[PDB]
Ligand SMILES: Nc1ncnc2c1ncn2[C@@H]1O[C@H](COP(=O)(O)OP(=O)(O)OP(=O)(O)O)[C@@H](O)[C@H]1O
């Protein structure tokens with residue numbers, strides 16, 4: 198139904214455990230996201246840090262998505278023809294961590310979180326291919 | 337059956353994944369035919385690679401297509417890879433998946449070109465490109481930590497999180513084994529001997545590798561060398577001159593820590609390492625400190641570990657805990673780590689497919705390999 202079609206789509210192959218379309222302009226809000234997971238809770242403050250002009254404090258400070266503490270690996274969110282930020286969660290004591298890609302479109306952020314062991318390059322390519330589709334449609 | 341191909345500036349190391357060691361190590365050189373007219377001379381070919389190019393040095397113009405880790409001429413490289421698959425491993429590359437390595441910070445265009453050649457030219461059925469340092473970290477069986485990699489041309493500090501290199505915090509130092517070799521040369525000349533030529537550089541390189549060491553306290557070892565022959569060693573030249581090295585033994589690697597010995601304004605390897613850590617996420621500084629791993633030829637110096645240990649201790653927050661790891665096999669780390677990664681079932685899930693290429697083309701490398 199509407200944007201939920203995109204989530205359901207991202208999630209179908211079993212390789213991911215969370216996904217989300219988030220409107221970043223004006224008043225940032227989640228458009229669609231997996232229920233009872235992480236990205237569903239993303240705040241507009243968090244969204245402002247992902248897209249704000251400071252591209253370097255979040256290296257040393259880290260950043261949260263939905264209050265989940267994350268570590269940035271590559272930032273090219275604002276770079277033409279790249280459009281991605283790659284992160285990995287941080288956990289306590291041997292508890293698994295997960296790769297995440299956020300891709301920027303004209304109006305949206307597409308977020309995606311792999312299951313344990315899923316490689317960052319696959320999440321990157323999946324997230325980025327979905328974003329493209331959106332971007333092709335003026336989104 | 338996957339292939340591992342580690343491309344240094346000087347030696348190409350190729351093998352099969354899961355093997356303990358490369359099944360082929362050969363100089364990374366292309367020779368073309370040098371003035372001599374087609375047939376008589378000997379080289380009728382317009383291309384010659386590696387050891388046969390070495391043995392045929394005369395009547396050939398010898399090139400290294402790799403420089404400081406970065407590919408410099410794509411025409412030559414192509415023949416290294418051509419020769420790697422065909423003459424050295426005796427394989428049909430269209431039949432094997434391959435893991436390539438690349439330098440930290442390998443530029444965009446280069447990553448893309450590496451990808452194009454593998455697919456359009458060798459018709460690789462699948463490929464992946466991995467940061468050399470990252471592979472050295474797996475060879476030591478960790479996934480978090482910072483790699484200090486030092487070869488002959490360049491030194492890099494690469495912090496790594498769960499197997500992901502952190503490019504904003506990678507530092508490059510233009511100071512490796514060559515500058516050391518040249519420095520040793522210089523101080524042996526000053527002492528009384530006379531190494532200045534290309535033939536003599538190789539003698540000195542060999543002295544470096546054979547007798548140099550890092551001193552725990554630099555002032556103190558100087559004072560011990562000044563008051564005793566206890567540290568002097570003798571060395572047997574290609575002719576028959578036997579010579580004596582004292583001071584020089586540990587004054588030479590000392591330039592890794594004090595680059596003003598070479599007229600350089602840089603900080604040394606200890607401080608370059610700390611500066612990388614300080615650029616990482618406060619939450620993993622702890623694990624980098626206790627997982628600092630050395631790799632490459634120039635890290636084989638006895639005492640370099642203890643000294644790194646000591647120098648990091650001083651720079652770091654005082655109740656942090658430091659650990660230098662220096663694999664007894666740390667010369668061959670990069671190809672080993674490669675063999676570890678590319679031999680897993682998992683690997684199928686990371687690589688770039690030939691069809692993925694047909695679909696997305698060369699820029700797929702920026703999405704998939706990191
Ligand atoms: N046991 C040793 N002690 C000190 N230095 C060594 C030792 N073994 C090798 N080296 C140095 O390492 C350098 C060459 O080895 P290495 O294969 O790491 O570099 P490369 O891959 O040929 O070139 P680059 O690293 O510039 O791409 C030389 O400077 C060599 O003298």
Ligand SMILES: [Ca+2]
Pocket residue numbers: 343344345346347348
């Ligand atoms: Ca080499």
Ligand SMILES: [Ca+2]
Pocket residue numbers: 530531532533536
């Ligand atoms: Ca001379």
Ligand SMILES: [Cl-]
Pocket residue numbers: 280300325326327328329332
């Ligand atoms: Cl995109």
